[PDB]
UniProtKB/TrEMBL annotation, chains A, B, C:
A GO molecular-function annotation: inositol-3-phosphate synthase activity
Protein name: inositol-3-phosphate synthase
InterPro entries to which the protein is assigned, alphabetical: Myo-inos-1-P_Synthase, Myo-inos-1-P_Synthase_GAPDH, NAD(P)-bd_dom_sf
UniProt family annotation: Belongs to the myo-inositol 1-phosphate synthase family.
Domain of life of the source: Eukaryota
EC class (word): isomerase
The protein's annotated pathway: Polyol metabolism; myo-inositol biosynthesis; myo-inositol from D-glucose 6-phosphate: step 1/2
SUPFAM superfamilies named in the record: Glyceraldehyde-3-phosphate dehydrogenase-like, C-terminal domain (SSF55347), NAD(P)-binding Rossmann-fold domains (SSF51735)
Amino acid sequence: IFKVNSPNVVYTDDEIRSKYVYRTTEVTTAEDGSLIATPRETVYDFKVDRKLPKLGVMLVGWGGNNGSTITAGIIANRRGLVWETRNGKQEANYYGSVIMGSTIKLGTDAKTHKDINIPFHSVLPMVHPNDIVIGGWDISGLNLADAMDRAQVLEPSLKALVRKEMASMKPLPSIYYPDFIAANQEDRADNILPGNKKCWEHVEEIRKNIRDFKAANGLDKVIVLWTANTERYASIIEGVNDTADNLLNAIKNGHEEVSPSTVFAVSSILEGVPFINGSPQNTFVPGCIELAERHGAFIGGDDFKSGQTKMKSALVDFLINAGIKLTSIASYNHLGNNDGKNLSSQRQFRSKEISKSNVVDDMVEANTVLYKPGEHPDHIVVIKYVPAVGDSKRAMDEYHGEIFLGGHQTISIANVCEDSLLASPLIIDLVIVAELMTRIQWRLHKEDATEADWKYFHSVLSILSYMLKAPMTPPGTPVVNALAKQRAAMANIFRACLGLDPENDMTLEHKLF
Amino acid sequence: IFKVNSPNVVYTDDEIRSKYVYRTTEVTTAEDGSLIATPRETVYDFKVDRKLPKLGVMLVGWGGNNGSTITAGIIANRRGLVWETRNGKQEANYYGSVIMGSTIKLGTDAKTHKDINIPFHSVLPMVHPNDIVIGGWDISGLNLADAMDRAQVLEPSLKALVRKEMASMKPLPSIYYPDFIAANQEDRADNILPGNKKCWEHVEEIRKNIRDFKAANGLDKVIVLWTANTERYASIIEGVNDTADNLLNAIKNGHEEVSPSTVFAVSSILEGVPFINGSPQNTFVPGCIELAERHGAFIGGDDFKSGQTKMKSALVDFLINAGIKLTSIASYNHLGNNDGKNLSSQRQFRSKEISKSNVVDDMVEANTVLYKPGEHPDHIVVIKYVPAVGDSKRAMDEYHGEIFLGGHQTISIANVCEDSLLASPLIIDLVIVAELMTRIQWRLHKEDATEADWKYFHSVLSILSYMLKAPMTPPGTPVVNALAKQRAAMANIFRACLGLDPENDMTLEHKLF
Amino acid sequence: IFKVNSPNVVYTDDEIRSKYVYRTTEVTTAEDGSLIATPRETVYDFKVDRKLPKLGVMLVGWGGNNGSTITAGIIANRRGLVWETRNGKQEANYYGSVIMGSTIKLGTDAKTHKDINIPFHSVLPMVHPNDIVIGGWDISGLNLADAMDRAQVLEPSLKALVRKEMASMKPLPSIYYPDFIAANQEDRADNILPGNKKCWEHVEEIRKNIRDFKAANGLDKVIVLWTANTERYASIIEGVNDTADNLLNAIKNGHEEVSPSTVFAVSSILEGVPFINGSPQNTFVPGCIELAERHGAFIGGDDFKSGQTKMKSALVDFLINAGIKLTSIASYNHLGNNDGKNLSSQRQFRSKEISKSNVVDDMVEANTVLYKPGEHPDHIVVIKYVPAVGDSKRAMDEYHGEIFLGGHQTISIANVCEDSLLASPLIIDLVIVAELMTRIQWRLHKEDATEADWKYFHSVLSILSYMLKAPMTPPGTPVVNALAKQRAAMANIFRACLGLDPENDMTLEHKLF
Ligand SMILES: NC(=O)c1ccc[n+]([C@@H]2O[C@H](COP(=O)([O-])OP(=O)(O)OC[C@H]3O[C@@H](n4cnc5c(N)ncnc54)[C@H](O)[C@@H]3O)[C@@H](O)[C@H]2O)c1
Ligand SMILES: NC(=O)c1ccc[n+]([C@@H]2O[C@H](COP(=O)([O-])OP(=O)(O)OC[C@H]3O[C@@H](n4cnc5c(N)ncnc54)[C@H](O)[C@@H]3O)[C@@H](O)[C@H]2O)c1
Ligand SMILES: NC(=O)c1ccc[n+]([C@@H]2O[C@H](COP(=O)([O-])OP(=O)(O)OC[C@H]3O[C@@H](n4cnc5c(N)ncnc54)[C@H](O)[C@@H]3O)[C@@H](O)[C@H]2O)c1
């Protein structure tokens, strides 16, 4: 633990009221066409609620690969289970999680002159993942022990320990619209609500399920996470999905271009729970976003940045920030789970391909020294279904680049990654950060500020962009896709609630003496 | 171009006098063992000399692979030469250079709400690489056109254009101490000064050469860069190399444990020119550093971070900052130039292995959540001599990591990199940044400050750490090895001389509205 | 099953007496320097003993990685055990074995015109691996269940089934000469016979152990296989190891340059059991071979061709037989078992490096169109100890080649191979083929041949060369290292005992009609 010694930071047993000075640079164009840089300061008052709630996560796709892996891993970490591998004994951990497995720099030691590093989870009052309750919906009624055996992700020794408690968990019936997921997912749907079309009864039932989850479990806050199959893009039609009331009427009129995910998101917005989409499909259409802003409900980005895309975000940033001109990026993946079986259809593969292909455009528009306006590298993404490899995704990347005097650099990467074991800690990170963001309020520093001036963060949580492949940002704002930039954004926003200045890495006390 | 509109920044035609507030966090231990974080502010006055000098670089190892590549590339960029490749026409560029091929963010647009990115070279008044004069010493008297043909790095079409002017360049005689480089480099030395041992006449001759370079060329500033063969570690002996006067006496007494690089560095310190070591050997012993601090001469780090080590700095940082526990790093390189031939000896390979192996220790000591005190991954580095591959170094990396619930991640990387084409822009970056650092002065902001209170940066230039594999820091300070951290340090130090605040990446104007 | 309908093949319930015509080509130099090719025919009589013996294998290094894996796998296949993996249910098999997992072509169908393929194990009367008895010596007294847990090769579910029967197996004490294996293997030796030097009592004890194994178990034939640590090369000294009697005197005189493996081989030759060396060290010195020929004892080659070397034998053959000039071969391996720990010493790594480096010389001497006399590619082999990877050896190969008009081909291979699971079926293959070779006799076809003219194959079994990295051939004969050639040799020699002609692959009945 640590505390901040500053007149600007006031600690109360319920609140961490703090004063912060946001310092930025504003650029305006001069008369002769040159740029003028002006330092700007905005004084902000931040309020952080110290009380930790009893948090529940509702998973849409509970019986999937990722959902079963999560519920098993939370049980394993909560009980401190030790199991047997060929190498010997294995203990439960939260590796692969930036919040639960990484540290950030607090400051420099006065005496030793060395850096003080504290866990990322300990910066702000945050909910511990061991106490997270899981539930939700699935079109397949298989219990989560049998779902665990279907997934083929976990070792038999661990499954033996977690099977007794995971056999009592059965997902609630969900909604199946046949048009949106692949034709080979017909035989999977046995636990489905009455109706293959879009209706207002589905919204009522989903709201009832969220209510009953919170009531029966005894939870203070609920979060809904979409971990279901990738869907096809729902066409944007004027009068159907372009406005909150238009969409609310389209649900009742039973229009044939409303995704199941949109029904879940609408139910979440009407019940006041945050909704995070873990799939590349366009769950939030114009009208879902406006309904979220009209009600004050928090909504997150799309997809999960776990594996080849995370390393791509690191590498493209590193290579373009070093002066190497990337001309080709070729991503090849083949996998043999139900995720790859659903993406074997073109209409459902297109969404994932679009999500994977749009991670490098911001980095190539930032480097105007290498890339001319309109110059983009050849970015190809291929995903194939190989049933024999199972959950072990094999990714092959070829990065082709141009260097000094026309030289050629080629970087070939072979990644053997367990998909579910790389996305589960991301879900933990998403829920923990979203719960924290529901507990932070802000206002402008005035000499007569009242309690009525407290405001929340914008309904679209871009602070989750570290864990999201296709970040969703507030309407009209740019998108940040660099991994280091997103991690720094999260860390510095967390430090701003403590009145601490952002990390600059200059270290002038070691250079000027 | 751009200008800063701020009362703290005053622009004169010769100076950029600016006022900056260095904001950091200081950590002190409380009585009950907890940590206390206190915001600290140090007010600094920075003075930047706007006048650009005529800069000359003296290369020790001019006829090597890297030196010939540099002199050819500077000619190619200066003349704007276009040559023929199989793919068609190729123009000269400075790709692979962070200063000449990358951009940094200046600020946000007032109207568009989009980011303004300006070239890294345009942030501060900096010397253009097209105007850099080259010269120096080599033990081989071959002219640099024949040295270019010996190197086997450049295409015949480019060599045809640059051969006429590169055949008039002949390196000055150098000093050859047989004990320090490999036994297979005996036949290479034909241009050597009289003497196989350490003497004060060598210092006189090297100082004379630096003087004559500056006088004949008409230069305002000179920088010496060691681009010669990797040397063996010179033993630290009390009374020989532990003190500036002890070392100055050891040169005259002709002790047998003084490297040729130490003679070059001593000559540079006595003539007031900066010296940058581009090799893993310990050029600066205790006594060379003290002589540098006693005279005010600037000295740089060791080795060149070009290729597998740069990507290692990116990847290890990315993986450990994401919660993945690296257990094994295995670097394999084989190459067939004179660099690999000199490293075929164990005593000269040890220095490069030590330099390559110490890039990840700071990242594993920062993450106390994953690594216990004393826990280090298995880091192996292998370098082999394969004459058939030439300058094209083939690097194979295996990163083995532990992830959620005991999962295994393996990342296999095959890099085919032209060594000389990845290190030449690094040399340009080093000389440009070092020249700029010779033009920056600092002081503490007082109400009665005088002109006599202006001070330079510390003699050990750690701001070059981005381009250096084994960064040398001021005595008693920690070492930063993360690539993103070093680039951010350079950018934020450059912005501090303009009175601008460091980049925080928070973007609160897009989240709070 | 199948039978041969031919007057040349006579089937008896105990013998398969057959007549074969060995057809080859002989080359003699003409007067004008040209070559003359003459067809030669040698008529051979082959006798194959149909009776299958009760076979026992004695392993030197029983408690090692490979020995424990073998004894466990034989139990698993014998009992037909099914265990649990993450993917589901796994049954026992003999995959990775050329005899037990591959087929050979018997002939063409008269009616269908399609090929008839029969299992390699069914060509000749051969011992089934399910009935093989295991035993032997080890310097470590740990039982083989605890040795199995030490090895970290097998899944916990399989180990649970095999642990009860593998805990009753304890290796006999062995002989430890400290000079020959690495200094870090001191603490491993607790089950050692009295004596750190070479003595005749060791031969008596080893012979007693072989006798008692056969007597107690009730076996008809015994084979000894060296699966112990790699040793250093024993110097060839005149009067010590250059003659059978010289070596027999050197054992008694206690010379300090006689390997432990030589003592085992000598004991085997004096007891009449075959000895196969599975390590790169020179077990058979001049004098051991002569003793083998003087007694009639069978001795095999050196090392195990399992993994990167097998693929190297395939690839180098394929590339050089296709017209591609290999200029560089770079093999990198790192592993973390006791094998890699013993090879961390230079004197013990040299033997493995020599064994791995000499697999391509025969292929480059066969292609006189590409390689001039004395032209050899750059062949580098690196083996490193990385304790974190365990038995999973990571091999990285770079094959660099020259193609049409000076083009460059590069082939980069990343192999993740379980070392013990690739060498265990090789040991099964070696013992099965060696037992068969002890049951085959030959003679020249004469009109008055008697029973006294029956002869055995030469004491040095080169027919095992498929499974051996460093093939040992009869003194004065060339070595075959191509994998396809060795497999074809084995198949055609097996078919020659059946009176069948070698496979030619011409298929003229489908081309001439
Ligand atoms: N590395 C990763 O695992 C990763 C990374 C990025 C994105 N994603 C995305 O996350 C999602 C989950 O991946 P997975 O491998 O766990 O999936 P999966 O293939 O196991 O299927 C998800 C589950 O959702 C269920 N489902 C489908 N439609 C439903 C509906 N309308 N209501 C309720 N349940 C429904 C399916 O029956 C299935 O059990 C996918 O969309 C995938 O594309 C995964
Ligand atoms: N990617 C890279 O190229 C890279 C990266 C990191 C470090 N380095 C280091 O940079 C240096 C230059 O590499 P290179 O491939 O150009 O080297 P190289 O093999 O071509 O040899 C450098 C030159 O220095 C000369 N030399 C040696 N001792 C000398 C002395 N006392 N005085 C004058 N000249 C002397 C040699 O004759 C040779 O011509 C090496 O030490 C190398 O280890 C290179
Ligand atoms: N893929 C492979 O596994 C492979 C391939 C080629 C060659 N080999 C060779 O096969 C051998 C076995 O490999 P491993 O990984 O099973 O070995 P290992 O590292 O497990 O050690 C072999 C065993 O032999 C024992 N031993 C050593 N000296 C002995 C002696 N004098 N008498 C009795 N026991 C003795 C050791 O204590 C150890 O238990 C090694 O020499 C290895 O180099 C293995």
